Design an enzyme around this catalytic site. Structure first.
Site, mmCIF file in Angstrom:
data_model
loop_
_atom_site.group_PDB
_atom_site.id
_atom_site.type_symbol
_atom_site.label_atom_id
_atom_site.label_comp_id
_atom_site.label_asym_id
_atom_site.label_seq_id
_atom_site.Cartn_x
_atom_site.Cartn_y
_atom_site.Cartn_z
ATOM 1 N N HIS A 41 27.169 -7.099 54.711
ATOM 2 C CA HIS A 41 27.346 -8.417 55.337
ATOM 3 C C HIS A 41 28.741 -9.015 55.124
ATOM 4 C CE1 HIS A 41 27.189 -11.002 51.751
ATOM 5 N NE2 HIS A 41 26.039 -10.477 51.373
ATOM 6 N N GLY A 143 30.391 -16.069 46.690
ATOM 7 C CA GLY A 143 31.378 -15.057 46.377
ATOM 8 C C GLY A 143 30.961 -14.022 45.356
ATOM 9 N N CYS A 145 28.493 -11.765 45.647
ATOM 10 C CA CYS A 145 27.926 -10.541 46.202
ATOM 11 C C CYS A 145 28.812 -9.346 45.885
ATOM 12 C CB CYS A 145 27.714 -10.673 47.709
ATOM 13 S SG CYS A 145 26.355 -11.811 48.079
HETATM 14 C C1 LIG Z 1 27.313 -13.302 48.389
HETATM 15 N N1 LIG Z 1 28.710 -13.712 48.131
HETATM 16 C C2 LIG Z 1 26.255 -14.413 48.589
HETATM 17 C C3 LIG Z 1 25.486 -14.771 47.284
HETATM 18 C C4 LIG Z 1 24.741 -16.101 47.351
HETATM 19 C C5 LIG Z 1 25.544 -17.364 47.629
HETATM 20 C C6 LIG Z 1 24.784 -18.455 46.887
HETATM 21 N N2 LIG Z 1 24.077 -17.719 45.840
HETATM 22 C C7 LIG Z 1 24.033 -16.412 46.052
HETATM 23 O O1 LIG Z 1 23.497 -15.559 45.334
HETATM 24 N N3 LIG Z 1 25.329 -14.044 49.695
HETATM 25 C C8 LIG Z 1 25.157 -14.792 50.788
HETATM 26 O O2 LIG Z 1 25.727 -15.876 50.976
HETATM 27 C C9 LIG Z 1 24.223 -14.257 51.858
HETATM 28 C C10 LIG Z 1 25.057 -13.783 53.070
HETATM 29 C C11 LIG Z 1 24.354 -14.385 54.320
HETATM 30 C C12 LIG Z 1 23.157 -13.513 54.745
HETATM 31 C C13 LIG Z 1 23.524 -12.233 55.489
HETATM 32 C C14 LIG Z 1 24.421 -12.522 56.682
HETATM 33 C C15 LIG Z 1 25.660 -13.304 56.240
HETATM 34 C C16 LIG Z 1 25.296 -14.601 55.521
HETATM 35 C C17 LIG Z 1 23.770 -15.705 53.781
HETATM 36 N N4 LIG Z 1 23.434 -15.363 52.383
HETATM 37 C C18 LIG Z 1 22.508 -15.948 51.594
HETATM 38 O O3 LIG Z 1 22.315 -15.574 50.425
HETATM 39 C C19 LIG Z 1 21.701 -17.104 52.183
HETATM 40 N N5 LIG Z 1 20.300 -16.793 51.957
HETATM 41 C C20 LIG Z 1 19.526 -16.283 52.919
HETATM 42 O O4 LIG Z 1 19.902 -16.038 54.052
HETATM 43 C C21 LIG Z 1 18.076 -16.001 52.575
HETATM 44 F F1 LIG Z 1 17.484 -17.079 52.071
HETATM 45 F F2 LIG Z 1 17.980 -15.060 51.661
HETATM 46 F F3 LIG Z 1 17.397 -15.601 53.641
HETATM 47 C C22 LIG Z 1 22.070 -18.527 51.685
HETATM 48 C C23 LIG Z 1 21.167 -19.564 52.370
HETATM 49 C C24 LIG Z 1 23.528 -18.872 52.019
HETATM 50 C C25 LIG Z 1 21.832 -18.649 50.172
#
Ligand SMILES: *[C@H](N)[C@H](C[C@@H]1CCNC1=O)NC(=O)[C@@H]1CC2(CCCCC2)CN1C(=O)[C@@H](NC(=O)C(F)(F)F)C(C)(C)C
Ligand SMILES: *[C@H](N)[C@H](C[C@@H]1CCNC1=O)NC(=O)[C@@H]1CC2(CCCCC2)CN1C(=O)[C@@H](NC(=O)C(F)(F)F)C(C)(C)C
Lengths: 306, 306
Positions: A41, A143, A145
């Site tokens: 992603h 950030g 991930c």
């Molecule tokens: C990675 N840098 C990040 C980790 C995350 C931010 C807050 N706490 C964490 O652990 N991941 C994300 O932001 C992912 C990436 C995302 C989904 C795939 C397509 C691109 C955007 C959004 N995302 C999320 O973790 C979401 N959560 C969800 O979509 C879920 F609930 F799991 F379905 C958000 C809402 C931003 C936390």
């Protein structure tokens, strides 16, 4: 003596962490030999986080669309491919800090250490368990991930987790290092949710043995129980079933303390029915379930890694 | 989100750990530049662990009585001296892995990470606080002495603790890196004991702010309190007094959450008088006091180190 939530030394993993940028998204990658692994992603745009087509998105990229920074030294990407939900970025330099390693997938109930990272730079280390519902109760911010979870066995790092997302209850979901999600979660922004969890029974028993090793005995009793009768009580308290194999795995701890496994089950039974009545075990007022029988033996017996 | 007992990445410290042998005693040493630091009781004999004279014991040693192993490479000792309760072993090789570092002495209430080691090999990392009674609730077995506690600030390791002994309640005592004990403990096998501890009030407040940041709000209330009236309640529950400086240090957390410090004190007051009534905060059924206001901001805001 003493008993702490203990993580593995993180140095071998710290030397693998790098920064991966694509567009305006920056996250972490894991650099082993001449490959950098990161969550796919990273290539997702803000316009369609809801239902991306990663095959389509990736075929539109070139090698030069990926900026990889190892410290203050830029790594040139010379190839890229997708493996399930991770990206494999081939770079023109092998990581000279590559440890002996494996990619392993763990079971719910097993534990691992997490090296949380931002911008390729390690921030902290902590110990997690894979929950029965395939989430982990992590600590992760924007950030993070591409941070990884791992175990160490002598000199060899067994990577088991890469971080991808946070679910609405504040828990976390991710993949093994082949890009396959733990549990029924996808790397799209949908309405997914954890779903109901259970307590890891064998681990609670392990931690009760840790307490006895450390001199907490107040919860012991003269009673015993059958495995069947114990599991009838476990079901009612949302604990997961105990198997004969779990009893076998607790054998060493049973032998060290002289407390039969089923005798400890009778103590857990009374703890579940009566609560703890203002007392604590190993500094906790809850029954702790994120220590495996291995974790307890290691900490109470003193295994190192090199 | 999420909140974990988070240690610093340990890699910079792992590259400093070595094995020190004198006679039949083996423990850990810390190798920085061309000096190895270790607990002076390494030279103590089994015959008189009760009341050694370390000046006498050390004048009877030669350089060659100290075997130092850095991994599988032996280090030649070329000088030795005592500084308070630590030994300074001058060796003919500077550690090429020496990080930027300081020797700092911490205050009760402050936290640090411990890299537990056996035979010069790191075993695990965990987070500790200096208790008000100058013990630490560690996890340490035979051979762990010379393991160090530390904090990281960008690229610089601030060493604050070296492990020396275990007290009869299973807690631990040691020195700063100048060999000066924390608290009223000596490196002799006498009948010493910890003495009564208190709860670190400012840290509990910090952790309540962490909970609010993470969505646990159930313990909040519409009431407030004066600092004086709060401290009258703190004394009765063996909490230590809260000062205006503690209130000032909690300012940023107060501003982020919109909850006045004294309002949070009123919530802590009601938690102390009523208990938690079957509920948990940040996965704990006890009020947690081993997170400083700095720890909370760092974890909830995402600071890294390089
Ligand atoms: C990675 N840098 C990040 C980790 C995350 C931010 C807050 N706490 C964490 O652990 N991941 C994300 O932001 C992912 C990436 C995302 C989904 C795939 C397509 C691109 C955007 C959004 N995302 C999320 O973790 C979401 N959560 C969800 O979509 C879920 F609930 F799991 F379905 C958000 C809402 C931003 C936390
Ligand atoms: C260092 N390798 C070791 C750590 C200790 C072993 C068990 N858990 C631990 O943390 N330290 C010791 O064994 C020190 C050394 C000792 C005192 C100085 C003279 C040489 C022998 C004995 N010792 C202890 O920790 C004692 N404790 C005490 O003497 C005390 F209670 F603190 F007064 C023992 C009883 C062996 C734990």
């Amino acid at each position: 003596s003493g008993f702490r939530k203990m993580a593995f030394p993180s140095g071998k993993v710290e030397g693998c962490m790098v920064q991966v940028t694509c567009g305006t998204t920056t996250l972490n990658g894991l650099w082993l030999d001449d490959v950098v692994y990161c969550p796919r992603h990273v290539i997702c745009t803000s316009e369609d986080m809801l239902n991306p087509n990663y095959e389509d998105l990736l075929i539109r990229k070139s090698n030069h669309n990926f900026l990889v920074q190892a410290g203050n030294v830029q790594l040139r990407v010379i190839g890229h491919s997708m493996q399930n939900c991770v990206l494999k970025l081939k770079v023109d330099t092998a990581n000279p800090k590559t440890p002996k390693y494996k990619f392993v997938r763990i079971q719910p109930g097993q534990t691992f250490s997490v090296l949380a990272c931002y911008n390729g730079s390690p921030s902290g280390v902590y110990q997690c368990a894979m929950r029965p519902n395939f989430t982990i109760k992590g600590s992760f911010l924007n950030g993070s991930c591409g941070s990884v979870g791992f175990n160490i066995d002598y000199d060899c790092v067994s990577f088991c987790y890469m971080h991808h997302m946070e679910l609405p209850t504040g828990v976390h979901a991710g993949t093994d290092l082949e890009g396959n999600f733990y549990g029924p979660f996808v790397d799209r922004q949908t309405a997914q949710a954890a779903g109901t969890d259970t307590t890891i029974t064998v681990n609670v028993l392990a931690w009760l043995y840790a307490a006895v090793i450390n001199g907490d005995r107040w919860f012991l009793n003269r009673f015993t129980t059958t495995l069947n009768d114990f599991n009838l009580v476990a079901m009612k308290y949302n604990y997961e079933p105990l198997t004969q194999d779990h009893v076998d795995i607790l054998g060493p701890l049973s032998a060290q303390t002289g407390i039969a496994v089923l005798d400890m089950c009778a103590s857990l039974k009374e703890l579940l029915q009566n609560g703890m009545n203002g007392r604590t075990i190993l500094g906790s007022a809850l029954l702790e379930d994120e220590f495996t029988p291995f974790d307890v033996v290691r900490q109470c017996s003193g295994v190192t890694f090199q």
